[PDB]
DNA sequence: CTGTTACGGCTCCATATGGAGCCGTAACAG
DNA sequence: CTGTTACGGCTCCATATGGAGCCGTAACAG
């Protein structure tokens, strides 16, 4: 009953040997990058998944005894398909179909109650429920411009180059229809434009092909630009491009129900399937509980009503008390999707599986922790084991086994520091997490807080989603934290309104604004910058030294040496993305590709350059006994001491060290960077830039996957940034960040359609005095 | 701790409700087609696999509580890839690589010891170990024939039709090389033929394209027939066609080792990696056990030697004591692959998984049951549960829970007859399996056995595989059973030699014969027929009524009625594969195809014909109150009484009923037929045909997935077939079939390279008197 | 009448070019 | 000297026709 793992050396683990107990609550804690995520995901989950899949990416581990099939729950989601909804994912729609087939009355089979089968799906919308076609205005935004000027901006239909296939198709269509490309689009007859857009509907046409050395003709049909784009979207970066020219509208016949008339006719207690499926989860549970039926109906529907009640109770106990069963699963955030999946797993009944979670209490107010922990304990008691990777102080007190990694990060960290229960790690003298739990070092509350300087941002007519037509004022030049219960609409109010409008007004961005009437004070904000968890770059030619800009200065320093001047090199010669200095064998990528007869291409280190990404001639030049490869393979901590003489590089290196990246090296590929490292890199880049006093910064849950020490360091960095003159607005839930803020805006008083208004606004002391605010009560308790 | 399933209605189950205990040995027993396989595979395994996959084909079941992820072990295998071998599948090659890297001495990393990575794979053969190219003789078997006559018989390169693309390519090549297609291939210059076969190696050539209404020219390169075929095979029915023209040969450099010279240089105790990997499993285990090393080597290699010893012990305990670790996994039978997978799962250490097996004791002699049961019990004790579907009398006595289905088959069967331990089902009066276990009805041994009629089949120079140059004599006109321990070479001796040579001599088949010198007495066998478990047909237009030939007679009977003569129909008008009588809406298929926007095509019953596969005009004709659809939807049991008047149909229907197919209906699609039903259909078809007295029948394990009653019925059918004059040779392991045979040939005395000679031959009484024969000892015990 | 041989018709399965994002470089302004 | 703006070069990701097996049918022989 022990998951014994011996000889674990994946990534930066120093040959650890742990003994995780089975069927007990085990939490893994460590600093950002200490290896807490590697030990779980790269080793244990990978080994379990491989063991199961090979029966029905081997980790670098000697042997693991006692493993079980594992399921990973992470805050990742994709577009998936419009067919899948919340009701389908939660596996409640099937039971609803069974209930409607068994007890529904005409106004009776479970085959026509679903939109996934031809029996009941609406023929007009094919069961999707929203005809997503291509808007003619989006296809040709500039009707005044002629065809030669590039009226058709859609990909795959550009006639800019006469040698392109699209140009040949356009010429063939013009020949068939007796038209001229140079003629203006508006001046062209509407019939010709309609025929070009919608194609010939299979009509036979003559097409002439002209090439550099080949001439001929062939007979075929013209699908049309719109039809070809629709076919490409149906057969499908590309998805986003297709959606950019597509406008979503409800089906004219079914009115978004995505069901046939006969299926919608059957109703239970005066409400059809769509009425039940398009309400709040709490309201639906209340309606189901109060439902009354005859003795025979109760006897024949008990086995379905019990399951429906249990699943709805679990879903509302997880924390989602505002969702709608008809909501499309594509438009779900990471936290909502993760909690939906956790509820589905708790309700399915799977037994004997290792569950590996990724910070379950993400994007969730502190008032719901007492119920999320109960749900997790019920899941554990179902007959499973948990590998919850949690940092919140409220999670450790309700666990059984605590495994703390460290003691540092990167190269320093990786070894198991201390294990045991909460008390043992609390009394352990050499544990950072235990030290913070004991209260030896705590985030001290500020004494004096900044006051607004008379400049305010005004929001008028905020009515997007569930906003109840509220007006808010955000002070400028003072740290601002926007709190609120789950589903209150704060995330919408920020992202879909304020950031979008500011980007449109300042950066000339092209995004759809929110349902906001007017915004006052825009002229006082020179620039707006959004910091997210997305990686800095996807190509291998991007490193935390190139992004920060220190690489250009270091290249200039290398080129200013005596040897470089003697050999007549260039400032940019020592770069791995230009021709002349990089190793020509691998073209500067640093990894060669070898293809086998029946295997995918396997990447191996380059033999000529030995993985240094540079030629021998470039490495010949030495600066203070170090070459370009040695510098690129040196960590920031050593670089701080190495370049103390030159202040231009020293300032940026010190900024990067102060952000908290003193364990990675300047040559790490951007692919290997995680979300936290990317956020820290972006923060360092923003800090390095000169302060203009009119900068707006927006952070969306900055404490995602950060330990308490990382939270303290980020609080210090944010306060230092705010002291420079710029103002930053942060959507936060952690009480540590909230208690050190300057101005707090609270949105409530409940989630979903119940809330959406402003409850309290002002200093934290003022908010703590309001009885009708959970955030105020918690702030009073902390203070 | 109960896998409770309620409301199971998949296939032909009559709403059963069972309670399978957890972590205990559970065996499912029933007649062939009673639903024992459905309840396991279609319901429980499908539900478990779906539940697990949806977390990282919904069964028609209400709800299942307590399920766990399930792994299905079945006697199915594919070509897979040449990379995978027995050593790779068993997951021993990785530990061997680790051992060689850690303790191997030069004559040291685990990266160059594998052929799956560029570090150690042989560059010449790309790590495959056998250069499988296209033989020039196979490409052009008839060099005398000209190009126009069809010299190139390879698919995708035929020039029979001048309008084909291959013909255009051939014409372009002839124009470029100044050659004539009409010229004989032999008379053509060798250089031109070599250039055509191997392509132009990227050389630019001129190609002229001529079509019905399009004329032009283009510049490209000719890949060549051989290169195109090789590329198609690499990028890949099709596999068999590609392998037909490909001859496997060992790599000239590595001599089949598939490793680099440096990797092969390292040796342990005078033997390199290939020497250890190319020996018997028992010999390898003995060599590893006797290996000696220093104290430090023992300390650093204990963790690998222990695992290697344990895995080899498990593999030899399963029953495979003759395999070679270097054997390619493609050339493995169903039983060997299933037992390899079972050994791998027993050794991996997976815990908390439902294991669903498919007759583990398949193709295994009765002497290894006492060890196979021990291995299965060890797997169960590892912390799992088992759903072994077994029929052998030696398996029930070592089980914990017995679930018996029935009481009949098809429509009659499906309900749970009796459950409990072995004693309770034995004392149950209404259980067929319990009745046979108690001994109420048993297969009585014959009193007098047939003697050879002086005609014998002579095998001279049998040396294929492990055969030790033996000569055997098979009597003609008497039932012959070929027994032998696992791996003795009986399967090779039969399939790869006798059947192949007989087919080549009589049916003019084109297969590679075995290593046989000469065969005497071939002229005494007029026809040879092989009966296998393959389905009768794959297309939906094939039924157990069309294959037997009764459908033609029934169509003639329908056309001979008064109404058919009045309306002037045809004899073949009432068929679902011709134009005129079938429902034109679905073109006689009976299922319409509906395609959605983002879903695969979903098959639904045809609306016009309502699933009857016929038009209204055809159904208007009524014969004795029954139409063609009613007849096609009528079971054989009713058809026996219905057509008692006409003897032409009655004979075939009675034969089909006597075979044991009195539960399926004449309209069942061949896709839904299983292996046992296909074998029974083939037996009925062979029995219906007239007896010529010179027919040879070969059966390969006919008792696969048959209950004891089915075994008795098949024994009776085989004896009736033999009494007609024809002789049948059966490879059997079950003692029930063996004890009722007439002539027995025993091959031993061990498996693999140890055996291959003939031990005993003659009547079962004579064989039972030989001390050096396990089959003889078991026959003595039974008798 | 029944079996065999050959042929016709049917269904199923198999086989390079443009856009987005980033890094480097020249020019300009405070 | 430092920040900003515009442009060039590089890498990654996206989009019908023939052969095999079976069923039906005409012709022929015992
Ligand atoms: C990379 O990957 C290694 C593992 O990082 P990891 O612990 O997964 O980060 P995080 O805990 O923030 O996910 C780090 O040493 C870093 O250098
Ligand atoms: N695509 C959508 N369609 C309809 N309603 C939506 C959509 N997206 C969000 N909403 C509604 O807007 C609200 C936004 O809440 P949100 O700000 O995401 O809460 P939190 O800040 O806790 O994540 C939700 O209650 C949801 O009901
Ligand atoms: C088909 O499928 C049903 C289930 O057959 P099944 O029990 O799986 O056969 P078997 O046990 O021989 O595999 C049968 O009723 C038959 O009509
Ligand atoms: N492709 C092959 N290459 C080398 N040896 C083979 C191959 N196929 C079979 N053999 C050998 O021929 C023997 C045939 O055994 P077989 O009679 O099939 O076993 P069983 O009696 O269990 O059916 C095996 O011992 C095997 O070692
Ligand atoms: Zn519709
Ligand atoms: Zn290189
Ligand atoms: Zn080789
Ligand atoms: Zn039809």
């Amino acid at each position: 009953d022990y998951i014994v793992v011996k000889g674990a050396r994946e990534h930066n683990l120093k040959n650890i040997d742990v003994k995780i107990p089975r069927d007990k609550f085990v939490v893994i804690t460590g600093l950002s990058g200490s290896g807490k995520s590697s030990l779980a995901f790269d080793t244990i989950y990978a080994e379990g998944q491989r063991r199961y899949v090979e029966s029905l990416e081997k980790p670098d581990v000697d042997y693991i005894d006692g493993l079980s099939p594992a399921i990973a729950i992470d805050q990742k989601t994709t577009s998936r398909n419009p067919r899948s909804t919340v009701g389908t994912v939660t596996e409640i729609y099937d039971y609803l179909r069974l209930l409607f087939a068994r007890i529904g009355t005409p106004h009776i089979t479970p085959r026509m109650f679903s939109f996934n089968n031809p029996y009941g799906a609406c023929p007009e919308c094919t069961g999707l429920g929203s005809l997503m076609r291509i808007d003619p205005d989006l296809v040709i935004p500039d009707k005044k411009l002629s065809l030669a000027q590039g009226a058709v901006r859609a990909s795959g239909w550009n006639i800019a180059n006469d040698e392109s296939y699209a140009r040949m198709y356009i010429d063939a269509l013009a020949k068939h229809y007796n038209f001229s490309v140079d003629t203006p689009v508006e001046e062209l007859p509407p019939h010709i434009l309609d025929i070009i857009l919608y194609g010939t509907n299979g009509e036979k046409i003559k097409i002439e092909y002209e090439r550099e050395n080949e001439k001929g003709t062939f007979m075929a049909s013209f699908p049309g630009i719109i039809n070809s784009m629709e076919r490409r979207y149906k057969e499908t970066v590309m998805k986003q491009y297709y959606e950019n020219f597509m406008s979503n509208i409800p089906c004219p016949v079914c009115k978004g129900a995505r069901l046939k008339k006969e299926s919608l006719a059957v109703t239970i207690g005066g409400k059809n399937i769509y009425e039940v499926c398009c309400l709040s989860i709490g309201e639906a549970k209340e309606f189901f509980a109060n439902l009354n039926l005859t003795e025979r109906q109760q006897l024949i529907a008990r086995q379905i009503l019990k399951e429906i009640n249990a699943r709805l109770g679990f879903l509302v106990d997880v924390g989602l008390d505002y969702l709608t069963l008809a909501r499309a699963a594509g438009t779900l955030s990471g936290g909502e999707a993760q909690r939906i999946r956790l509820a589905t797993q708790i309700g399915s009944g799977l037994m004997g599986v290792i569950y590996i979670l990724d910070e379950p209490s993400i994007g969730l107010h502190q008032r719901d922790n007492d119920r999320l922990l109960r749900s997790l304990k019920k899941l554990r008691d179902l007959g499973n084991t948990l590998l919850v990777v949690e940092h919140d102080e409220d999670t450790m007190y309700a666990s059984d086994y605590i495994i703390d990694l460290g003691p540092g990060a990167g190269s320093h960290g990786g070894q198991i520091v201390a294990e045991g229960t909460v008390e043992e790690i609390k009394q352990n003298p050499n544990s950072v997490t235990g030290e913070y739990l004991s209260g030896r070092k705590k985030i001290e509350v500020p004494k004096e807080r900044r006051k607004p300087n008379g400049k305010w941002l005004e929001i008028i007519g905020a009515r997007e989603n569930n906003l109840k037509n509220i007006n808010v004022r955000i002070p400028l030049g003072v740290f601002t934290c926007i709190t609120g219960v789950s589903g209150s609409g704060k995330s919408s109010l920020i992202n879909e309104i304020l950031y979008k409008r500011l980007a449109a007004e300042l950066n000339r961005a092209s995004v759809k604004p929110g349902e906001h009437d007017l915004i006052k004070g825009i002229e006082y904000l020179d620039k707006v910058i959004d910091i997210d968890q997305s990686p800095i770059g996807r190509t291998p030619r991007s490193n935390p030294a190139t992004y920060t800009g220190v690489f250009d200065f270091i290249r200039e320093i290398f080129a200013n040496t005596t040897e470089a001047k003697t050999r007549g090199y260039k400032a940019g010669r020592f770069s791995f993305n230009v021709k002349g200095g990089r190793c020509e064998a691998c073209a500067g990528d640093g990894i060669n590709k070898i293809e086998m007869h029946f295997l995918p291409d396997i990447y191996v280190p380059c033999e000529v350059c030995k993985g240094k990404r540079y030629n021998r001639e470039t490495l010949e030049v030495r600066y203070k006994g170090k070459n370009i490869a040695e510098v690129l393979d040196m960590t920031v901590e050593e670089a701080l001491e190495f370049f103390k003489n030159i202040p231009r590089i020293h300032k940026k290196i010190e900024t990067l060290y102060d952000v908290g990246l003193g364990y990675i090296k300047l040559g790490q590929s951007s692919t290997t960077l995680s979300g936290g490292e990317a956020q820290r890199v972006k923060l360092a880049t923003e800090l390095s830039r000169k302060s203009t006093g009119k900068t707006m910064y927006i952070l969306d849950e900055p404490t995602t996957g950060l330990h308490m020490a990382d939270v303290h360091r980020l609080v210090g960095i944010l306060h230092r940034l705010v002291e420079a003159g710029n103002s930053v607005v942060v959507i936060e839930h952690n009480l540590d960040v909230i208690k050190t803020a300057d101005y707090i805006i609270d949105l409530g008083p409940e989630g979903g359609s119940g809330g959406g208004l402003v409850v309290a606004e002002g200093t934290p002391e003022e908010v703590a005095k309001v009885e009708n605010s959970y955030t105020g009560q918690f702030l009073k308790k902390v203070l």
Side-chain angles (χ1 to χ4, degrees), chain A residues 1-16 18 20-22 24-41 43-46 48-55 58-64 66-73 75 79 82-90 92-104 106 109-110 112-115 118 120-125 127-129 132 136 141 148 150-151 154 156 160 166 172 174-175 184 188-190 195 199 202 216 220 222-224 233 245 250-252 254-257 259-260 262-266 268-270 272-274 276-278 281-282 284-291 297-298 300-301 304-305 308-320 322-345 347-357 359-365 367-369 371-377 379-389 391 395-410 412-422 424-425 427 429 431-434 436-437 439-440 443 445-446 449-450 452 454 456-477 479-493 495 497-499 501-504 506 509 511 513-514 518-519 521-522 524-531 533 535 537 540 542 544-545 547-555 558-559 561-564 566-569 571-572 574 576-577 580-583 585-588 590 594 596 599-600 602-603 605-606 609 611-614 618-619 621-625 628-629 631 634-636 639-650 653 655-657 659-669 673-685 687-689 692-693 696-699 701-709 711-721 724-725 727-731 733 735 737-741 743-749 751-752 754-756 758-760 762 764-770 772-783:
Chain A
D1 63 339
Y2 273 66
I3 309 162
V4 199
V5 56
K6 293 279 185 181
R9 290 176 307 262
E10 188 86 338
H11 274 145
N12 61 298
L13 286 145
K14 297 192 194 305
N15 198 357
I16 59 174
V18 318
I20 301 164
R22 262 195 89 81
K24 275 202 323 190
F25 201 44
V26 175
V27 295
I28 301 176
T29 304
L31 277 81
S32 178
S34 164
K36 59 187 186 298
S37 157
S38 67
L39 165 63
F41 269 67
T43 296
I44 278 170
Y45 164 70
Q49 195 256 350
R50 190 254 307 188
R51 288 265 186 78
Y52 181 83
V53 157
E54 198 206 25
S55 302
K58 43 181 291 292
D60 199 313
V61 59
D62 301 347
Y63 87 107
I64 308 172
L67 216 46
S68 309
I71 309 160
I73 299 174
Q75 50 207 10
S79 197
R83 301 280 191 181
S84 55
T85 75
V86 173
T88 292
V89 162
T90 307
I92 292 188
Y93 203 51
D94 298 333
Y95 288 177
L96 275 179
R97 278 159 43 180
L98 292 195
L99 180 59
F100 263 92
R102 192 162 296 182
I103 211 182
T109 49
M112 63 204 159
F113 270 123
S114 170
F115 44 72
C122 173
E124 185 85 1
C125 44
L128 292 195
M132 297 158 58
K175 154 188 293 201
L188 279 169
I195 288 298
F222 192 62
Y233 169 61
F245 316 119
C251 195
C254 49
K255 296 308 296 170
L259 268 89
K260 267 210 300 182
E262 177 203 46
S263 200
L264 292 195
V266 175
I268 296 171
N272 60 358
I273 175 73
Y274 196 65
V276 173
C277 284
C278 196
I281 309 200
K285 169 161 142 37
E286 240 175 83
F287 153 67
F288 267 120
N290 285 7
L291 188 137
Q297 314 199 67
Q298 276 273 31
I300 68 183
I304 304 310
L305 280 201
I308 285 291
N309 188 289
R311 201 97 72 175
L312 282 197
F314 283 129
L315 230 183
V316 75
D317 216 0
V318 168
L320 298 173
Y322 56 81
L323 271 188
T324 57
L325 281 169
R327 174 149 176 173
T331 178
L332 272 167
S333 47
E336 268 157 345
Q338 165 179 3
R339 276 166 286 130
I340 273 177
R341 195 166 308 124
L342 178 81
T344 290
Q345 294 315 299
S348 65
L350 215 71
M351 186 189 295
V353 155
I354 295 185
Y355 270 125
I356 285 151
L357 272 66
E359 210 173 350
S361 59
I362 176 60
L364 181 130
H365 202 238
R367 62 147 207 177
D368 295 357
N369 254 2
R371 276 146 44 172
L372 176 60
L373 286 188
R374 201 177 309 178
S375 172
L376 262 190
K377 264 153 62 174
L379 169 64
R380 177 226 80 191
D381 177 60
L382 193 76
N384 291 335
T385 184
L386 289 157
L387 267 300
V388 161
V389 180
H391 308 168
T395 302
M396 312 214 173
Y397 274 84
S399 66
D400 285 289
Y401 207 69
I402 288 180
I403 290 162
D404 204 57
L405 270 70
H412 285 195
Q415 47 181 118
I416 313 296
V417 180
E419 322 176 14
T421 56
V422 52
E424 288 155 66
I425 191 179
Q427 66 154 87
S431 304
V432 176
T433 306
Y436 273 12
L437 255 67
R440 274 191 282 288
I443 299 168
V445 316
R449 306 185 196 279
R450 269 81 76 93
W456 298 67
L457 258 188
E458 196 172 1
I459 299 299
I460 302 299
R463 67 169 50 86
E464 178 90 353
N465 271 343
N466 59 5
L467 287 166
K468 252 75 180 160
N469 196 2
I470 62 169
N471 292 351
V472 308
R473 284 169 45 242
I474 290 147
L476 266 187
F479 184 48
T480 307
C481 272
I482 290 182
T483 72
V485 296
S486 309
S488 177
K490 55 194 201 308
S491 160
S492 176
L493 163 64
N495 289 342
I497 298 169
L498 192 140
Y499 169 62
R501 189 52 194 276
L502 283 193
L506 271 303
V511 287
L518 277 175
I519 296 187
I522 306 169
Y524 302 102
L525 288 194
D526 204 2
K527 189 187 305 179
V528 51
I529 299 298
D530 164 88
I531 284 153
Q533 307 272 327
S542 43
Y547 208 119
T548 313
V550 65
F551 209 61
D552 198 75
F553 298 156
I554 214 158
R555 260 214 310 278
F558 270 12
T561 66
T562 295
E563 178 93 27
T566 297
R567 284 164 84 139
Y569 284 162
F574 316 136
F576 52 86
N577 212 5
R582 68 185 208 248
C583 172
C586 47
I594 299 182
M596 305 274 189
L599 265 293
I602 301 309
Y603 279 140
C606 166
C609 47
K612 304 294 187 66
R613 318 146 169 269
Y614 278 81
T618 306
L619 297 177
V621 175
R622 295 251 170 111
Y623 165 74
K624 314 298 194 159
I628 185 69
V631 170
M634 183 213 307
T635 63
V636 183
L640 190 68
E641 182 79 288
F642 194 58
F643 292 118
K644 60 98 176 179
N645 204 10
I646 299 181
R648 186 159 30 95
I649 291 94
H650 187 32
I653 291 305
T655 294
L656 188 63
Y657 175 50
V659 172
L661 267 179
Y663 56 91
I664 71 157
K665 58 182 181 289
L666 309 185
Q668 176 152 1
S669 294
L673 279 189
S674 76
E677 282 147 283
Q679 177 180 0
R680 289 176 170 182
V681 162
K682 292 169 187 178
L683 275 183
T685 302
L687 248 177
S688 74
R689 211 198 321 282
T692 51
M696 196 57 163
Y697 290 107
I698 285 296
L699 313 185
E701 266 291 282
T703 76
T704 295
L706 273 74
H707 197 250
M708 267 156 281
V711 163
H712 181 103
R713 188 189 300 275
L714 191 138
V715 157
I717 291 302
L718 266 183
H719 268 85
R720 180 154 88 76
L721 202 151
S727 68
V728 55
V729 173
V730 174
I731 305 178
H733 277 132
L735 261 294
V737 178
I738 288 169
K739 68 182 180 180
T740 189
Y743 207 80
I744 290 179
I745 301 188
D746 191 272
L747 277 80
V758 174
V759 175
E765 210 53 24
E766 313 187 17
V767 180
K769 297 178 311 202
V770 170
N772 196 3
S773 58
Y774 320 103
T775 300
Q777 263 174 309
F778 280 177
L779 269 179
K780 172 179 172 63
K781 196 55 89 193
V782 173
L783 291 179

